[PDB]
Amino acid sequence: PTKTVPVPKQFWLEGQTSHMITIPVSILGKDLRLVATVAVRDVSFNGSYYDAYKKVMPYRCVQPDLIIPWPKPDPIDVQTNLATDPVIAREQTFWVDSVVRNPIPKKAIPSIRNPHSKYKRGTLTAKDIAKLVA
Amino acid sequence: PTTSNLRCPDDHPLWQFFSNKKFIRSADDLPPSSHIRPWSIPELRHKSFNDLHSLWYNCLREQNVLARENHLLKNIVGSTHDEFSELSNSIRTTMWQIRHVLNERELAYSASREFLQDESERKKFLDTLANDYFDDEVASMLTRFQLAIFGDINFIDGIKFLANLKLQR
Amino acid sequence: RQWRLIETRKIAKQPNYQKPLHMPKERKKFPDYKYGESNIFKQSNKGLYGGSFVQFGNNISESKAKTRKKWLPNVVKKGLWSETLNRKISIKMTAKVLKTISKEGGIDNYLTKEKSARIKELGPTGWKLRYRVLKRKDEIENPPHK
Amino acid sequence: SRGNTYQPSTLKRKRTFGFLARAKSKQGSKILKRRKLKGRWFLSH
Amino acid sequence: LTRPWKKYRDGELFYGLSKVGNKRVPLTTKQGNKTMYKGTRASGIGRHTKFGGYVINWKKVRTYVTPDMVNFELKPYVNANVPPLKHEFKGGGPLDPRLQLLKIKEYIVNGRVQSEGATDSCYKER
Amino acid sequence: DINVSEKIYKWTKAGIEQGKEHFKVGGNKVYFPKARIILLRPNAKHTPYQAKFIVPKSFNKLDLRDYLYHIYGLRAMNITTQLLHGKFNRMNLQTTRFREPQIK
Amino acid sequence: SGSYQHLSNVGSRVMKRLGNRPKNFLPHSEKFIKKSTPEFMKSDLKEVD
RNA sequence: AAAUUUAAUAUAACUAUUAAUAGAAGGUUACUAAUAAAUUAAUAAUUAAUUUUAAAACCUAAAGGUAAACCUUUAUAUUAAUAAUGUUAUGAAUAAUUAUUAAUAAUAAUAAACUAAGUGAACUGAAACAUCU
RNA sequence: AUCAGGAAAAUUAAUGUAUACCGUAAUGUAGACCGACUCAGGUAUGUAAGUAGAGAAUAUGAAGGUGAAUUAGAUAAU
Ligand SMILES: [Mg+2]
Ligand SMILES: [Mg+2]
Ligand SMILES: [Mg+2]
Ligand SMILES: [Mg+2]
Ligand SMILES: [Mg+2]
Ligand SMILES: [Mg+2]
Ligand SMILES: [Mg+2]
């Protein structure tokens, strides 16, 4: 479905002579089916491998033997300053090591976790109990 | 007054609030969400404290640059595109993950300490370790590591243990 | 008689402890009174009233003209000797209570009488007094070393 | 000439009708509770 | 006129859209007497003086501690080509002491050996 | 000896010479600050030697100075705070009044 | 715009009220929205929460 | 062989009855106040059940105040013990800062109806009214 | 003079100081407050050019401010 609607010069593409342009309207998945000259209809979704899509992708079953694969995820060349490179991201710079010196300074604890937290409660000692009961 | 009278420094620390020397990051010059992914908690889990700190600071810096830009977009042009906002949100998520991991590590350490304090189990653990370790150079290395880990009362105890080990071998 | 305004009082059942959001700073010196403190004729909590309270009834004329009136017990402030405490204890005292005390032979005796009725018709102050006396007695009987 | 009976002064108004004033006294507490039960959005100045 | 596009007398206000409104609303710094001081969680820093001044106490003044060894290679985002990692913890919780002990033992045996040095990994860790 | 202002100035100078802090670092360390600052464009009244930021409502002047030095290696010599009024805004007119942010 | 709304979250309750409009009066708001958008921006499909 | 209608069902109404089961956060504005597992069953991802676990700003009579969402205390606390450090007076003594270990307190937001108890009107009815109601 | 006139928180010496938070627009004898209205009402304090004069009376007005959500004509009776 592609409706023809008059669009401003702001949103013009390099070529559009008239203000009139044809553009695609969205469609509900319920109103369109899978092809493979075929029409799938019902899909099962039971098994589930991981593509390395880099995610655990389920199997599309039509009749559970016939599997239709997911399409090929488009390649993507990362060349941004704000994205760290893979190897660096993945590297290991912390092993548990000690049981005497903590991993983080005493002074940095307030930053990562709230003292004066009103949900602490704690206690419930024997001495305390003794103190309360008459 | 004229600006020719000035000599605006090129490496002035206030340029650090912009991407490169640029008023707005263009739609083309932003990192698209297809490429960018926020840091995972598990992945972070094995990262040093210093490195984590550095990462956090970097994130903050990035947010600042986004933040300014976002403000400009909102207040002046009055745009609703919110790419910058999304980016900021992503950064925030990462930051929170980092924070969580930091907390978690501390908690783990505390737990370990508690376990150690329970003297019945700790002794058993030590014994098991000894058994496991019982090459000579390799043993020495392992023993050295153990000593380091151990490292006034505690120190004394460690020393005693070392002595005992030596006696045994 | 009936102890309706005593044995009807109810206090928040304590949860026993094998912590609470707000624990008190001090230590409960005295044992909890079963029936608690009276929220009805609070004048009574200061002393020994014998479970007597203010009644409210009708003044009635020769024309049967009703008009609300109250009835007070005959309270008297009275310093009375306690052998166990070794001092005179002054308190508010319904004259009935005084009479009872006289009959029974001493304030300690009155306090330390076992029956549930007696317990009911002590106040919180009365209860405290009883605790003091019995504890003292125990101490007298039983030094730390036999 | 009547009509101008309300002579605003922020101090007086917060001190008399303010949330803190209400919450401090038993009667005030009652009022606040009443307003909560009605579901009023604004419990007092 | 106040505004020349409205010539005729309409139901328009000198400023704004309505004189009235909810007056029972949290008050800010700007409103109140001279004596009304609101404050904005900014200064529990020092101590006021007997005379009106303010003596700062630095044992309580927030400073921000940037790490001296800045790893600039760590960036706010990560490459999409890296899949998200999924730790496993069958030996109850990541903050389980037993697991930590095991890890320590492993470290002692080995000494700084990387588990996810291979960038090509769905789940791992024990 | 000499008076207080002079002393302060001297201290500042010394700090500058050193290439460290030109102000007494508070013995109160925060490691992971969530705060952010917006760099604003300069008004007609501001010089090129002045820059201004929108900062947290709960931000201290001292804190801002510290923050700039540590995160951005920027030496802020003098700092001036300006808290802005929140004006009442209302959308529908059937909807309640409320104030816009007090911004610092 | 010229607001500073983005820097704050104020009128939180009000926002919630206007954000979480009961679903049976969703037709109303949506109609208005439809009315106040150009032909190229608007779409015939109903939003999901 | 797909569509159309009819009747029933939602996370998405309230009201009355009957039957079953059980007895529970609001606000304010921002340096926004996030989660992490395990085990068992179903079939590596899975959903469910059973669990442990992180965070969680400020206010909502009683840390102590106030003009609710602020201020003031100062658990990035004090004391002790030690360790590196600079100064002074005579290897020993005194004070200052940082760092580890130990000791020492922390936060009344909590319903409503129902129940029991204390006090307890009057209008009204009596074709007036006071006994009575 | 008679009317008889507030309350409450010390010195020296040695050692010190990096100076927090908030108010700050404009309006304020008013179109920006209280009066249902851009309402001849109500609303606290200081300075209030000279000339003149007993004065903050009264006249003028240097400077500053203002000439307005009704105009234009006509001006019967009233
Ligand atoms: Mg009125
Ligand atoms: Mg009064
Ligand atoms: Mg008005
Ligand atoms: Mg004002
Ligand atoms: Mg005050
Ligand atoms: Mg009753
Ligand atoms: Mg007027």
Side-chain angles (χ1 to χ4, degrees), chain A residues 1-13 15 19-36 38-41 43 45-54 56-64 66-119 122 126 130 132-134, chain B residues 1-105 107-113 115-117 119-120 122 124-128 130-131 133-134 139 142-143 146 148 150-151 153-156 158-161 163-167 169, chain C residues 1-17 19-20 22 24 26-144, chain D, chain E residues 1-70 72-87 89-115 117-118 122-125, chain F residues 2-104, chain G residues 1-47:
Chain A
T2 56
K3 83 272 194 72
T4 319
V5 171
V7 178
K9 297 180 178 188
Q10 299 293 343
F11 302 92
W12 262 13
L13 272 52
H19 294 273
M20 215 72 207
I21 186 68
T22 179
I23 50 168
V25 248
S26 70
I27 312 90
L28 224 300
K30 195 150 280 145
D31 211 57
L32 58 78
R33 268 62 176 283
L34 247 162
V35 305
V38 183
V40 170
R41 305 206 300 246
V43 187
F45 290 91
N46 40 42
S48 40
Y49 72 102
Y50 91 87
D51 190 282
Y53 275 118
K54 287 89 186 200
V56 190
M57 300 275 98
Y59 284 112
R60 290 195 292 204
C61 309
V62 174
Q63 193 181 327
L66 202 166
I67 293 169
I68 297 177
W70 297 110
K72 298 98 205 295
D74 294 21
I76 38 101
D77 301 8
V78 180
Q79 305 188 345
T80 64
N81 295 353
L82 308 329
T84 194
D85 62 307
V87 173
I88 293 295
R90 240 68 199 284
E91 85 168 303
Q92 228 274 30
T93 43
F94 177 89
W95 299 268
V96 176
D97 185 317
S98 306
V99 212
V100 163
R101 198 224 305 285
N102 50 30
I104 45 182
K106 185 187 170 72
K107 290 272 190 277
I109 292 162
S111 302
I112 58 158
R113 178 251 306 288
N114 185 239
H116 297 61
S117 182
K118 71 194 193 67
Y119 316 89
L132 205 159
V133 175
Chain B
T2 201
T3 199
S4 305
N5 222 104
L6 282 336
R7 292 186 305 94
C8 182
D10 171 50
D11 200 350
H12 178 76
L14 209 61
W15 276 122
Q16 211 166 348
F17 284 92
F18 304 66
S19 67
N20 65 309
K21 277 72 183 308
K22 200 165 59 167
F23 200 98
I24 313 291
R25 289 216 282 252
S26 310
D28 191 283
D29 312 337
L30 274 165
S33 70
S34 59
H35 304 167
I36 268 51
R37 158 191 160 283
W39 293 70
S40 207
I41 308 168
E43 172 291 316
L44 281 167
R45 270 196 266 263
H46 50 70
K47 284 288 196 183
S48 86
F49 164 67
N50 179 250
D51 95 56
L52 271 183
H53 207 173
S54 303
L55 168 56
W56 170 284
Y57 273 117
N58 285 32
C59 279
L60 178 140
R61 227 110 57 186
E62 203 50 42
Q63 263 178 344
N64 283 16
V65 313
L66 265 324
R68 153 188 145 281
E69 174 46 50
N70 172 53
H71 165 100
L72 278 169
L73 226 73
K74 299 273 184 172
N75 202 255
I76 306 311
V77 38
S79 208
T80 185
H81 288 113
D82 73 65
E83 209 85 331
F84 301 106
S85 196
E86 285 284 19
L87 261 58
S88 277
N89 174 234
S90 301
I91 292 163
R92 227 180 76 83
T93 57
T94 82
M95 273 177 151
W96 84 234
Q97 311 247 87
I98 286 164
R99 194 169 190 263
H100 169 260
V101 323
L102 285 158
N103 194 41
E104 191 177 40
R105 292 233 277 249
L107 265 94
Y109 165 85
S110 187
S112 296
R113 273 280 291 273
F115 212 97
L116 184 136
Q117 228 71 354
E119 203 177 43
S120 62
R122 79 97 79 172
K124 285 160 53 58
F125 157 88
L126 272 162
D127 293 2
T128 230
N131 287 7
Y133 102 69
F134 287 131
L142 308 208
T143 51
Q146 197 266 0
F150 225 119
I153 185 70
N154 265 22
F155 196 64
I156 288 160
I159 290 158
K160 284 191 291 190
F161 197 84
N164 275 33
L165 289 172
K166 285 171 179 180
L167 169 140
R169 179 165 290 190
Chain C
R1 62 172 292 172
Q2 226 70 276
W3 297 262
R4 217 226 334 155
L5 306 175
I6 297 96
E7 70 205 310
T8 306
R9 299 186 224 145
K10 324 212 82 180
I11 320 84
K13 290 160 185 172
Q14 291 279 29
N16 62 336
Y17 305 106
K19 84 161 285 187
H22 206 103
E26 227 80 335
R27 328 95 213 179
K28 271 67 179 297
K29 293 182 70 181
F30 306 85
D32 294 342
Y33 195 175
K34 173 161 187 182
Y35 307 108
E37 184 167 308
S38 83
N39 319 297
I40 191 269
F41 172 50
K42 278 152 153 275
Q43 164 176 0
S44 79
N45 298 330
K46 287 284 197 170
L48 278 267
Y49 281 58
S52 72
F53 296 87
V54 152
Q55 187 190 348
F56 280 91
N58 294 255
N59 182 254
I60 290 170
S61 190
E62 196 175 42
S63 68
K64 292 97 81 180
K66 288 195 180 312
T67 17
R68 304 308 255 113
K69 75 172 280 183
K70 72 148 73 100
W71 318 69
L72 286 152
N74 191 6
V75 162
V76 298
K77 169 262 236 161
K78 197 70 164 150
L80 297 186
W81 186 257
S82 163
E83 290 183 1
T84 302
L85 276 276
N86 212 54
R87 71 195 177 80
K88 73 203 311 196
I89 39 174
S90 59
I91 35 163
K92 298 293 190 184
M93 267 254 190
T94 307
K96 199 190 201 82
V97 174
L98 193 65
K99 227 218 307 186
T100 61
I101 292 272
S102 158
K103 188 195 181 299
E104 287 208 345
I107 295 52
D108 299 353
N109 290 12
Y110 180 87
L111 297 166
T112 194
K113 174 171 162 57
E114 173 50 35
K115 261 57 166 188
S116 64
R118 175 53 45 76
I119 291 167
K120 289 197 206 85
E121 76 189 44
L122 295 165
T125 43
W127 184 250
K128 287 173 188 175
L129 252 293
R130 156 177 254 209
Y131 171 76
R132 275 280 110 91
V133 165
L134 269 55
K135 191 54 154 281
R136 182 58 192 161
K137 265 195 183 73
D138 197 300
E139 286 163 10
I140 289 297
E141 199 186 44
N142 299 340
Chain D
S1 176
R2 312 282 275 101
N4 61 342
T5 204
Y6 167 76
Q7 294 295 335
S9 57
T10 307
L11 176 280
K12 291 226 284 181
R13 110 153 193 261
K14 294 287 276 175
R15 202 102 73 69
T16 58
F17 315 110
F19 180 98
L20 245 162
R22 297 305 192 198
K24 207 170 173 192
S25 76
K26 199 198 165 210
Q27 271 58 33
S29 181
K30 302 270 172 173
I31 294 158
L32 284 166
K33 192 187 299 189
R34 214 178 314 133
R35 291 173 80 76
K36 281 296 297 296
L37 294 190
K38 204 195 192 186
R40 298 219 84 127
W41 285 16
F42 316 118
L43 303 180
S44 269
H45 293 263
Chain E
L1 292 177
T2 289
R3 42 184 74 104
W5 55 97
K6 260 89 105 68
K7 296 186 200 167
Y8 66 80
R9 203 191 221 76
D10 202 335
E12 197 56 37
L13 288 177
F14 184 68
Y15 81 84
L17 294 89
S18 192
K19 290 183 171 185
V20 296
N22 179 44
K23 213 136 58 52
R24 301 148 97 107
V25 63
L27 91 179
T28 77
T29 58
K30 301 299 186 168
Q31 23 278 169
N33 207 3
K34 288 203 285 283
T35 56
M36 164 34 57
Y37 169 56
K38 189 73 189 307
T40 54
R41 314 203 198 114
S43 300
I45 285 300
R47 184 135 62 179
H48 287 104
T49 324
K50 197 177 76 175
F51 298 90
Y54 197 84
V55 165
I56 298 161
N57 111 263
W58 305 97
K59 199 162 62 61
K60 206 217 293 152
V61 175
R62 277 160 283 118
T63 62
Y64 303 110
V65 289
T66 308
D68 50 358
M69 302 162 288
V70 180
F72 294 115
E73 198 59 39
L74 289 165
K75 273 78 171 292
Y77 306 118
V78 179
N79 197 314
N81 297 312
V82 172
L85 200 44
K86 296 280 176 284
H87 275 38
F89 286 107
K90 56 176 59 52
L95 68 145
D96 196 58
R98 295 289 213 77
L99 197 82
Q100 293 302 116
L101 291 165
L102 195 285
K103 282 167 166 279
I104 295 151
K105 193 189 288 173
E106 283 173 310
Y107 172 97
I108 292 162
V109 170
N110 293 307
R112 318 197 88 76
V113 177
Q114 301 179 223
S115 183
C122 176
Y123 65 111
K124 71 168 204 78
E125 201 262 307
Chain F
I2 36 70
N3 228 320
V4 177
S5 47
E6 300 121 52
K7 200 168 205 304
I8 287 165
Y9 188 63
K10 186 69 178 296
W11 262 323
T12 322
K13 218 208 185 197
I16 291 154
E17 261 64 308
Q18 266 60 311
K20 58 183 51 159
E21 300 89 46
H22 61 272
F23 56 93
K24 183 152 190 179
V25 282
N28 176 288
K29 301 104 71 57
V30 160
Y31 280 70
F32 298 99
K34 205 130 80 298
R36 297 177 292 151
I37 59 177
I38 308 282
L39 207 216
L40 296 168
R41 273 185 280 170
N43 202 32
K45 74 195 180 199
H46 298 132
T47 53
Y49 283 53
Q50 287 167 338
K52 80 184 283 96
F53 308 89
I54 302 184
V55 311
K57 182 164 163 280
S58 75
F59 230 46
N60 193 354
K61 192 177 284 184
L62 308 195
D63 268 46
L64 187 264
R65 200 234 278 97
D66 180 278
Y67 175 100
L68 274 168
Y69 182 68
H70 283 134
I71 315 316
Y72 288 101
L74 211 190
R75 312 182 89 85
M77 295 303 96
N78 183 64
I79 309 196
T80 22
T81 314
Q82 19 254 219
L83 221 192
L84 306 195
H85 75 285
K87 62 135 150 273
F88 276 114
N89 89 303
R90 56 194 311 178
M91 43 233 68
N92 300 22
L93 188 47
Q94 290 83 312
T95 314
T96 319
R97 275 222 264 85
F98 63 87
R99 286 205 180 78
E100 272 176 300
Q102 285 255 251
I103 257 183
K104 196 172 200 161
Chain G
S1 298
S3 53
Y4 303 142
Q5 284 271 326
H6 51 270
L7 276 155
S8 193
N9 181 24
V10 169
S12 59
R13 188 217 251 109
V14 175
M15 298 338 288
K16 279 189 191 66
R17 283 304 207 286
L18 292 157
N20 298 28
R21 195 87 289 164
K23 317 269 190 177
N24 64 317
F25 303 114
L26 203 140
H28 174 55
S29 62
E30 98 173 20
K31 144 201 173 86
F32 270 74
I33 288 167
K34 252 271 192 170
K35 194 147 55 55
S36 66
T37 27
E39 198 179 355
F40 63 89
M41 290 281 195
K42 71 172 73 192
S43 52
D44 286 10
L45 277 69
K46 188 183 180 184
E47 274 79 17

